[PDB]
Coordinates of N, CA and C in Angstrom, one line a residue:
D1347 N 8.3 20.1 8.4 CA 7.2 20.1 9.4 C 6.0 20.9 8.9
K1348 N 5.9 22.2 9.4 CA 4.8 23.0 9.0 C 5.0 23.6 7.6
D1349 N 6.2 23.4 7.1 CA 6.7 23.9 5.8 C 6.2 22.9 4.7
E1350 N 6.0 21.7 5.0 CA 5.4 20.7 4.1 C 3.9 21.1 3.9
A1351 N 3.2 21.3 5.1 CA 1.8 21.7 5.1 C 1.6 22.9 4.2
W1352 N 2.5 23.9 4.3 CA 2.4 25.1 3.5 C 2.6 24.9 2.0
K1353 N 3.5 24.1 1.6 CA 3.6 23.8 0.1 C 2.3 23.3 -0.5
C1354 N 1.5 22.6 0.3 CA 0.3 22.0 -0.2 C -0.9 23.0 -0.4
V1355 N -1.0 23.9 0.6 CA -1.9 25.0 0.5 C -1.7 25.8 -0.8
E1356 N -0.4 26.0 -1.1 CA 0.1 26.6 -2.3 C -0.5 25.9 -3.5
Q1357 N -0.4 24.6 -3.5 CA -0.9 23.8 -4.7 C -2.5 23.8 -4.7
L1358 N -3.1 23.8 -3.6 CA -4.6 23.8 -3.6 C -5.2 25.1 -4.0
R1359 N -4.5 26.2 -3.6 CA -5.0 27.5 -4.1 C -4.9 27.6 -5.6
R1360 N -3.6 27.3 -6.1 CA -3.4 27.2 -7.6 C -4.5 26.4 -8.3
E1361 N -4.8 25.2 -7.8 CA -5.8 24.4 -8.4 C -7.2 24.9 -8.2
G1362 N -7.4 26.1 -7.6 CA -8.7 26.7 -7.4 C -9.2 26.3 -6.0
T1363 N -11.6 25.6 -3.3 CA -12.9 25.8 -2.9 C -12.9 26.4 -1.5
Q1364 N -12.7 25.6 -0.5 CA -12.4 26.0 0.9 C -11.2 25.2 1.5
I1365 N -10.2 26.0 2.0 CA -9.0 25.3 2.5 C -9.0 25.6 4.0
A1366 N -8.6 24.5 4.7 CA -8.6 24.7 6.1 C -7.2 24.3 6.6
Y1367 N -6.6 25.0 7.6 CA -5.4 24.6 8.2 C -5.5 24.3 9.6
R1368 N -5.0 23.1 10.1 CA -5.0 22.7 11.4 C -3.6 23.2 12.0
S1369 N -3.6 23.7 13.2 CA -2.4 24.3 13.7 C -2.5 24.6 15.2
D1370 N -1.4 24.6 15.9 CA -1.3 24.8 17.3 C -1.0 26.2 17.7
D1371 N -0.2 26.9 16.9 CA 0.1 28.3 17.1 C -1.0 29.2 16.4
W1372 N -1.4 30.3 17.0 CA -2.5 31.2 16.5 C -2.0 32.2 15.5
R1373 N -0.7 32.6 15.6 CA -0.1 33.4 14.6 C -0.1 32.7 13.3
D1374 N 0.4 31.4 13.3 CA 0.5 30.6 12.1 C -0.9 30.5 11.4
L1375 N -1.9 30.3 12.3 CA -3.3 30.3 11.8 C -3.7 31.6 11.1
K1376 N -3.1 32.7 11.6 CA -3.4 34.1 11.1 C -2.6 34.3 9.8
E1377 N -1.3 34.1 9.9 CA -0.4 34.2 8.7 C -1.1 33.3 7.6
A1378 N -1.6 32.2 8.0 CA -2.3 31.3 7.1 C -3.7 31.9 6.7
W1379 N -4.3 32.7 7.5 CA -5.6 33.2 7.2 C -5.5 34.0 5.9
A1380 N -5.6 30.3 3.8 CA -6.5 29.4 4.5 C -7.8 30.2 4.8
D1381 N -8.9 29.5 4.5 CA -10.3 30.0 4.8 C -10.9 29.6 6.1
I1382 N -10.5 28.3 6.5 CA -11.0 27.8 7.8 C -9.8 27.5 8.7
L1383 N -9.9 28.1 9.9 CA -8.8 28.0 10.8 C -9.2 27.1 11.9
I1384 N -8.5 26.0 12.0 CA -8.7 24.9 13.0 C -7.7 25.1 14.1
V1385 N -8.2 25.8 15.2 CA -7.5 25.9 16.5 C -7.4 24.5 17.1
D1386 N -6.2 24.0 17.4 CA -6.0 22.6 17.8 C -6.0 22.4 19.4
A1387 N -6.7 21.4 19.8 CA -6.9 21.1 21.3 C -5.6 20.8 22.0
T1388 N -5.1 21.7 22.8 CA -3.9 21.5 23.6 C -3.8 22.6 24.6
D1389 N -4.0 22.3 25.9 CA -4.2 23.3 26.9 C -5.4 24.1 26.5
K1390 N -6.6 23.7 27.0 CA -7.9 24.3 26.6 C -7.8 25.8 27.0
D1391 N -7.0 26.2 28.0 CA -6.8 27.6 28.3 C -6.2 28.4 27.1
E1392 N -5.3 27.8 26.4 CA -4.6 28.4 25.3 C -5.5 28.3 24.0
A1393 N -6.1 27.2 23.8 CA -7.0 27.0 22.7 C -8.1 28.0 22.7
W1394 N -8.9 28.1 23.8 CA -9.9 29.0 24.0 C -9.4 30.4 23.8
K1395 N -8.1 30.6 24.2 CA -7.4 31.9 24.0 C -7.1 32.3 22.6
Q1396 N -7.0 31.2 21.7 CA -6.7 31.4 20.3 C -8.0 31.6 19.6
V1397 N -9.0 30.9 19.9 CA -10.4 31.1 19.4 C -10.7 32.6 19.6
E1398 N -10.6 33.0 20.9 CA -10.9 34.4 21.3 C -10.0 35.3 20.5
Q1399 N -8.7 35.1 20.5 CA -7.8 35.9 19.8 C -8.2 36.0 18.3
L1400 N -8.6 34.9 17.7 CA -9.0 34.9 16.3 C -10.3 35.7 16.1
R1401 N -11.3 35.4 17.0 CA -12.6 36.2 16.9 C -12.3 37.7 16.9
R1402 N -11.4 38.1 17.8 CA -11.1 39.6 17.8 C -10.4 40.0 16.5
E1403 N -9.5 39.2 16.0 CA -8.8 39.5 14.8 C -9.8 39.6 13.6
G1404 N -11.0 39.1 13.8 CA -12.0 39.1 12.8 C -12.0 37.8 11.9
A1405 N -11.2 36.8 12.3 CA -11.2 35.6 11.6 C -12.6 35.0 11.6
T1406 N -13.0 34.6 10.4 CA -14.5 34.3 10.1 C -15.0 32.9 10.3
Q1407 N -14.2 31.9 9.9 CA -14.5 30.5 10.1 C -13.6 29.9 11.1
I1408 N -13.9 30.0 12.4 CA -13.0 29.4 13.4 C -13.5 28.1 13.7
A1409 N -12.7 27.1 13.7 CA -13.0 25.7 14.1 C -12.3 25.2 15.3
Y1410 N -12.9 24.3 16.0 CA -12.2 23.7 17.2 C -12.5 22.3 17.2
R1411 N -11.6 21.5 17.5 CA -11.7 20.0 17.6 C -11.6 19.4 18.9
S1412 N -12.5 18.5 19.3 CA -12.4 17.8 20.5 C -13.2 16.6 20.5
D1413 N -12.9 15.6 21.4 CA -13.7 14.4 21.5 C -14.8 14.6 22.5
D1414 N -14.8 15.8 23.2 CA -15.7 16.1 24.3 C -16.6 17.3 23.9
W1415 N -17.9 17.0 23.9 CA -18.8 18.1 23.5 C -18.8 19.3 24.3
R1416 N -18.4 19.1 25.6 CA -18.4 20.1 26.6 C -17.3 21.1 26.2
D1417 N -16.2 20.6 25.7 CA -15.1 21.4 25.2 C -15.6 22.2 23.9
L1418 N -16.3 21.5 23.1 CA -16.8 22.2 21.9 C -17.8 23.3 22.2
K1419 N -18.7 23.0 23.2 CA -19.7 24.0 23.6 C -19.0 25.3 24.1
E1420 N -17.9 25.0 24.9 CA -17.1 26.1 25.4 C -16.5 26.9 24.3
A1421 N -16.0 26.2 23.3 CA -15.3 26.9 22.1 C -16.3 27.7 21.3
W1422 N -17.5 27.1 21.2 CA -18.6 27.8 20.5 C -19.0 29.1 21.2
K1423 N -19.1 29.0 22.5 CA -19.4 30.2 23.3 C -18.3 31.3 23.1
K1424 N -17.0 30.8 23.0 CA -15.9 31.8 22.8 C -15.6 32.2 21.4
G1425 N -16.5 31.8 20.5 CA -16.4 32.3 19.1 C -16.2 31.3 18.0
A1426 N -16.1 30.0 18.3 CA -15.8 29.0 17.2 C -17.2 28.8 16.5
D1427 N -17.1 28.8 15.2 CA -18.3 28.6 14.4 C -18.5 27.2 14.1
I1428 N -17.3 26.5 13.9 CA -17.4 25.1 13.4 C -16.8 24.1 14.5
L1429 N -17.7 23.2 15.0 CA -17.3 22.4 16.2 C -17.1 20.9 15.7
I1430 N -15.8 20.6 15.6 CA -15.4 19.3 15.2 C -15.3 18.2 16.3
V1431 N -16.3 17.3 16.2 CA -16.4 16.1 17.0 C -15.5 15.2 16.4
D1432 N -14.5 14.8 17.2 CA -13.4 13.9 16.7 C -13.8 12.5 17.2
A1433 N -14.2 11.7 16.3 CA -14.6 10.3 16.5 C -13.4 9.3 16.4
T1434 N -13.2 8.5 17.4 CA -12.3 7.3 17.3 C -13.1 6.2 18.0
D1435 N -13.9 6.5 19.0 CA -14.9 5.7 19.5 C -16.3 6.0 18.9
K1436 N -16.8 5.0 18.1 CA -18.0 5.3 17.2 C -19.2 5.8 17.9
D1437 N -19.7 5.2 19.0 CA -21.0 5.5 19.6 C -20.9 6.7 20.5
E1438 N -19.8 6.8 21.2 CA -19.6 7.9 22.1 C -19.4 9.2 21.3
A1439 N -19.0 9.0 20.0 CA -18.9 10.2 19.1 C -20.3 10.7 18.7
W1440 N -21.2 9.8 18.2 CA -22.5 10.2 17.9 C -23.2 10.9 19.0
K1441 N -22.9 10.6 20.2 CA -23.4 11.2 21.4 C -23.0 12.7 21.5
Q1442 N -21.7 13.0 21.1 CA -21.2 14.4 21.1 C -22.0 15.2 20.1
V1443 N -22.2 14.7 18.9 CA -23.1 15.4 17.9 C -24.5 15.6 18.5
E1444 N -25.0 14.6 19.1 CA -26.4 14.6 19.6 C -26.5 15.7 20.7
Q1445 N -25.6 15.7 21.6 CA -25.5 16.7 22.7 C -25.4 18.1 22.1
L1446 N -24.5 18.3 21.2 CA -24.3 19.6 20.6 C -25.5 20.1 19.9
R1447 N -26.2 19.2 19.2 CA -27.4 19.6 18.5 C -28.4 20.0 19.5
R1448 N -28.5 19.4 20.6 CA -29.5 19.8 21.7 C -29.1 21.2 22.2
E1449 N -27.8 21.5 22.3 CA -27.4 22.8 22.8 C -27.6 23.8 21.7
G1450 N -28.1 23.4 20.5 CA -28.4 24.3 19.4 C -27.1 24.7 18.6
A1451 N -26.1 23.8 18.6 CA -24.9 24.2 17.9 C -25.1 24.2 16.4
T1452 N -24.6 25.2 15.7 CA -25.0 25.5 14.3 C -24.2 24.6 13.3
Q1453 N -22.9 24.7 13.4 CA -22.0 24.0 12.5 C -21.2 22.9 13.2
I1454 N -21.8 21.7 13.3 CA -21.2 20.6 13.9 C -20.5 19.8 12.7
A1455 N -19.2 19.5 13.0 CA -18.4 18.7 12.1 C -18.1 17.4 12.7
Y1456 N -17.8 16.4 12.0 CA -17.6 15.1 12.5 C -16.5 14.4 11.7
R1457 N -15.4 14.0 12.4 CA -14.2 13.5 11.8 C -14.3 12.0 11.9
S1458 N -14.2 11.2 10.8 CA -14.1 9.8 10.9 C -13.5 9.2 9.6
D1459 N -13.0 8.0 9.7 CA -12.4 7.3 8.5 C -13.4 6.4 7.8
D1460 N -14.6 6.4 8.3 CA -15.6 5.5 7.8 C -16.9 6.2 7.3
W1461 N -17.2 6.1 6.1 CA -18.3 7.0 5.5 C -19.6 6.6 6.2
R1462 N -19.8 5.4 6.7 CA -21.0 5.0 7.3 C -21.2 5.7 8.6
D1463 N -20.1 5.8 9.4 CA -20.2 6.6 10.6 C -20.4 8.0 10.3
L1464 N -19.9 8.5 9.2 CA -20.1 9.9 8.8 C -21.5 10.1 8.4
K1465 N -22.1 9.1 7.7 CA -23.5 9.2 7.3 C -24.4 9.3 8.5
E1466 N -24.0 8.5 9.5 CA -24.9 8.4 10.7 C -24.8 9.7 11.4
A1467 N -23.6 10.2 11.6 CA -23.4 11.5 12.2 C -24.2 12.6 11.5
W1468 N -24.2 12.5 10.1 CA -24.9 13.5 9.3 C -26.4 13.4 9.7
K1469 N -26.9 12.3 9.8 CA -28.4 12.1 10.2 C -28.6 12.7 11.6
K1470 N -27.7 12.6 12.5 CA -27.8 13.0 13.9 C -27.5 14.5 14.1
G1471 N -27.1 15.2 13.0 CA -26.9 16.6 13.0 C -25.6 17.2 12.6
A1472 N -24.7 16.4 12.2 CA -23.4 16.9 11.7 C -23.6 17.5 10.4
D1473 N -23.2 18.8 10.2 CA -23.3 19.4 8.9 C -22.0 19.3 8.1
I1474 N -20.9 19.2 8.7 CA -19.6 19.0 8.0 C -19.1 17.6 8.3
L1475 N -18.8 16.9 7.2 CA -18.4 15.5 7.4 C -17.0 15.4 6.9
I1476 N -16.1 15.2 7.9 CA -14.7 15.1 7.5 C -14.2 13.7 7.3
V1477 N -13.8 13.4 6.0 CA -13.2 12.1 5.7 C -11.8 12.2 6.0
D1478 N -11.3 11.4 6.9 CA -9.9 11.4 7.3 C -9.1 10.3 6.5
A1479 N -8.3 10.8 5.6 CA -7.4 10.0 4.8 C -6.0 9.9 5.5
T1480 N -5.7 8.7 5.9 CA -4.3 8.5 6.4 C -3.9 7.1 5.8
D1481 N -4.8 6.3 5.3 CA -4.6 5.3 4.3 C -4.8 6.0 2.9
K1482 N -4.2 7.2 2.7 CA -4.5 8.2 1.8 C -5.2 7.7 0.5
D1483 N -4.5 6.9 -0.3 CA -4.9 6.4 -1.6 C -6.4 6.2 -1.8
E1484 N -7.0 5.4 -0.9 CA -8.3 4.9 -1.0 C -9.4 6.0 -0.7
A1485 N -9.0 6.9 0.2 CA -10.0 7.6 1.0 C -11.0 8.5 0.2
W1486 N -10.8 8.8 -1.1 CA -11.7 9.5 -1.9 C -13.0 8.7 -2.1
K1487 N -13.0 7.4 -1.9 CA -14.1 6.6 -2.2 C -15.2 7.0 -1.2
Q1488 N -14.8 7.4 0.0 CA -15.7 7.8 1.0 C -16.4 9.2 0.7
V1489 N -15.6 10.1 0.1 CA -16.2 11.3 -0.4 C -17.2 11.0 -1.4
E1490 N -16.9 10.1 -2.3 CA -17.9 9.7 -3.3 C -19.2 9.2 -2.7
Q1491 N -19.1 8.3 -1.7 CA -20.3 7.7 -1.1 C -21.2 8.8 -0.5
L1492 N -20.6 9.7 0.3 CA -21.3 10.7 0.9 C -21.9 11.7 -0.1
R1493 N -21.2 11.9 -1.2 CA -21.8 12.8 -2.3 C -23.0 12.2 -2.7
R1494 N -23.0 10.8 -2.9 CA -24.2 10.1 -3.4 C -25.3 10.2 -2.4
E1495 N -25.0 10.2 -1.1 CA -26.0 10.2 -0.1 C -26.7 11.5 0.0
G1496 N -26.1 12.5 -0.5 CA -26.6 13.9 -0.6 C -26.0 14.8 0.5
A1497 N -24.9 14.5 1.1 CA -24.2 15.4 2.0 C -23.6 16.5 1.2
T1498 N -23.8 17.7 1.8 CA -23.5 18.9 1.0 C -22.2 19.6 1.4
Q1499 N -21.6 19.2 2.5 CA -20.3 19.8 3.0 C -19.4 18.6 3.5
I1500 N -18.7 18.1 2.5 CA -17.8 17.0 2.7 C -16.4 17.6 2.8
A1501 N -15.6 17.2 3.8 CA -14.3 17.7 4.0 C -13.4 16.5 3.8
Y1502 N -12.2 16.8 3.5 CA -11.2 15.7 3.3 C -9.9 16.2 3.9
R1503 N -9.3 15.3 4.8 CA -8.1 15.7 5.6 C -7.0 14.8 5.1
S1504 N -5.9 15.4 4.7 CA -4.8 14.6 4.1 C -3.5 15.4 4.2
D1505 N -2.4 14.8 4.3 CA -1.1 15.6 4.3 C -0.6 15.8 2.8
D1506 N -1.4 15.3 1.8 CA -0.9 15.3 0.5 C -1.8 16.0 -0.5
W1507 N -1.2 16.9 -1.2 CA -2.0 17.8 -2.0 C -2.7 17.2 -3.2
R1508 N -2.0 16.2 -3.8 CA -2.6 15.4 -4.9 C -3.9 14.7 -4.5
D1509 N -3.8 14.0 -3.3 CA -4.9 13.4 -2.7 C -6.1 14.4 -2.4
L1510 N -5.7 15.6 -1.8 CA -6.7 16.6 -1.6 C -7.4 17.0 -2.9
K1511 N -6.6 17.2 -3.9 CA -7.1 17.6 -5.2 C -8.1 16.6 -5.8
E1512 N -7.8 15.3 -5.6 CA -8.6 14.2 -6.1 C -9.9 14.2 -5.3
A1513 N -9.8 14.4 -4.0 CA -11.0 14.4 -3.1 C -11.9 15.5 -3.6
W1514 N -11.3 16.6 -3.9 CA -12.0 17.8 -4.3 C -12.8 17.5 -5.6
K1515 N -12.1 16.8 -6.5 CA -12.7 16.3 -7.7 C -13.9 15.3 -7.5
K1516 N -13.8 14.5 -6.4 CA -14.8 13.6 -6.1 C -16.0 14.2 -5.3
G1517 N -15.8 15.5 -4.9 CA -16.9 16.2 -4.3 C -16.7 16.8 -3.0
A1518 N -15.5 16.8 -2.5 CA -15.1 17.4 -1.2 C -15.1 18.9 -1.4
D1519 N -15.7 19.7 -0.5 CA -15.7 21.1 -0.7 C -14.8 21.8 0.4
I1520 N -14.4 21.1 1.4 CA -13.5 21.6 2.3 C -12.2 20.7 2.3
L1521 N -11.0 21.3 2.0 CA -9.8 20.5 2.0 C -8.9 20.9 3.2
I1522 N -8.7 19.9 4.1 CA -8.0 20.2 5.3 C -6.5 19.7 5.2
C1523 N -5.6 20.7 5.2 CA -4.2 20.4 5.1 C -3.5 20.0 6.3
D1524 N -3.3 18.7 6.6 CA -3.0 18.2 7.9 C -1.7 17.5 7.8
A1525 N -0.6 18.2 7.9 CA 0.8 17.6 7.8 C 1.6 17.9 9.2
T1526 N 1.3 17.0 10.1 CA 2.0 17.1 11.4 C 3.2 16.2 11.4

């Protein structure tokens, strides 16, 4: 389970940029404090409690993920620096980015499996573009496209360290170890 996730951080550290761990427990995120800690959306009462708990602990790059910008704005208020708009509906996603940008959100991230949706999010204000690899093999191609477009903070989400390493080589600067 989380032990597979852990073996890969091991390999990514060994291989040398920024590592992020997605996690539901806040201790695990701490034990892992991994440079970017992604508090996972599950009982917003507990999530906001982990952002808060991490902020007090001095954790420096706190991220929160949601499909709802209102939840992201709340997380931001409570100490999250990085606000991950989770796109599965394409157009309603770009709205979350747009709304957050209006609210003055500093580090908006956008999760998608399609580099063109990522490119568009980028234009609308997403500074962190997360390429979601679950058809793992191919997904570096998206990193490459975004690199070419001039995106400067490309993230790659994968449960496999070899794939993370390849993404990194194709220009991903944030490697998200996501083994649920």
